[PDB]
């Protein structure tokens, strides 16, 4: 079993920059390497075979280097479709995938655009209260979400999803929900949630 | 040339890949999985003639790679599953012969999930608000993965975001959003379509306002 080292797992680089990955084996491997891209959603799409040879229709922009050991995968002026994961594959002997390497590209601070969401009927009738927030194409991933009940904090009974980087955005969106029984749902009016000088978004159950 | 493979699906603690379009019998063959990290491992190859089997240590004996030339299909079965829970996919080496290739087409992919939690549709529930509007679904309570998130069968493209599901064991929950300009919603028509084939449960949920 040949063991494939690959570094470092994730990278974050500024558009037009340049960017480069490395894989180590634990044996010679004699050029017989390979690196695909993968997006989510897609087939792993190749990229580099035998070290350097660029596939047909692979901008130059990618390029690969190395011998015996050492090898390293390359990504010149940075562009936003390049935002995905990325591996190595030596096919020496047998096959040995390396760890992946994950890229995110820098940009320009952006605030979210936040929607709030009352329950809807059939939930509520099914003895259930979700109260849904989403902040949506902000920069960069680190955002909070505060959940205010009547004008009070409420901390139990939240979930929390970010995507990956949008890859033609080079923003996130983020999804914070508030599980609450039907029961206690009633008793109150107003539901709020905050993003953080914060953005404020709300209802009334009238 | 395609590889199309059939399930998959879930089990407590057989896949098969059919083959058209190039000559079968001529290159070896492989399978890869996904696990939940994004992490690509190999699993399995076969040679040209069924003769060659390989297996890496963190699969052998559990597993068996096994191939029918005459159907053009290629199989792989499975024993002992664990944290074996990923997306497997069958793959073709980039050339013929009994020599080592790269990878140059890929199956669509078929989800394993090994778990000791039991299949469980998902309820599904409009996001109605209460220049452009932000709609919405809640997809909550199902097992295992995946689900399948579309709006208006797949017309409404940009402008939406699907979160990743999350866990609150032993179920997930996920929900999708969607933008469109002002007006052409509640004028036209928005249906966020779900699907949870381990479930064979399919709803389609019209956004209606107030």
């Known amino acids: 079993d040949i063991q494939m080292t690959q570094s470092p797992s994730s990278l974050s680089a500024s558009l037009g920059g340049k960017v480069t990955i490395t894989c180590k084996a634990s044996?010679?491997?004699?050029?017989?390497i390979a690196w695909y891209q993968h997006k989510p959603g897609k087939g792993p799409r190749l990229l580099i075979h035998?070290?350097?040879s660029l596939q047909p229709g692979i901008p130059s922009r990618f390029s690969g280097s190395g011998s015996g050991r050492d090898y390293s995968f390359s990504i010149s002026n940075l562009e936003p479709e390049d935002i995905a994961t990325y591996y190595c594959?030596?096919?020496?002997?047998?096959?040995?995938f390396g760890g992946g390497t994950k890229l995110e590209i820098k940009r320009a601070d952006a605030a979210p655009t936040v929607s709030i969401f009352p329950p809807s009927s059939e939930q509520l009738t099914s003895g259930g209260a979700s109260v849904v927030c989403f902040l949506n194409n902000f920069y960069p991933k680190d955002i909070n979400v505060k959940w205010k009940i009547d004008g009070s904090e409420r901390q139990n009974g939240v979930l929390n999803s970010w995507t990956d980087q949008d890859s033609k955005d080079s923003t996130y969106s983020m999804s914070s929900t508030l599980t609450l029984t039907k029961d206690e749902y009633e008793r109150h009016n107003s539901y709020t949630c905050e993003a953080t000088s914060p953005i404020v978004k709300s209802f009334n159950r009238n | 040339v395609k590889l199309q493979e059939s399930g998959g699906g879930l089990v407590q603690p057989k896949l098969s890949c059919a083959a058209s379009?190039?000559?079968?019998?001529?290159?070896?063959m492989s399978w890869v999985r996904q696990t939940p990290e994004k992490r690509l491992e190999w699993v399995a190859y076969?040679?040209?003639?069924?003769?060659?089997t390989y297996y890496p240590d963190t699969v052998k004996g559990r597993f068996t790679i096994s191939r029918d030339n005459a159907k053009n299909t290629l199989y792989l079965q499975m024993n002992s599953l664990k944290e074996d829970t990923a997306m497997y996919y069958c793959?073709?080496?980039?050339?013929?012969?009994?020599?080592?290739?790269?990878?140059?087409?890929w199956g669509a992919g078929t989800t394993v999930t090994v778990s000791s939690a039991k299949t469980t549709p998902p309820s599904v529930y409009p996001l109605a608000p209460g220049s452009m509007v932000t709609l919405g679904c809640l997809v909550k309570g199902y097992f295992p993965e995946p689900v399948t998130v579309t709006w208006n069968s797949g017309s409404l493209s940009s402008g939406v975001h699907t979160f990743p599901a999350v866990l609150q064991s032993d179920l997930y929950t996920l929900s999708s959003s969607v933008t469109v300009p002002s007006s052409t919603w509640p004028s036209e028509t928005v249906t966020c379509n779900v699907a949870h084939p381990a479930s064979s449960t399919k709803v389609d949920k019209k956004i209606v306002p107030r």
């Open positions: 793959a073709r080496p980039s050339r013929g012969g009994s020599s080592y290739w790269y990878f140059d087409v």
């Open positions: 379009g190039f000559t079968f019998s001529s290159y070896t």
């Open positions: 076969i040679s040209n003639g069924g003769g060659g």
């Open positions: 044996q010679d491997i004699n050029k017989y």
């Open positions: 035998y070290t350097s």
């Open positions: 594959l030596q096919y020496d002997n047998l096959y040995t």
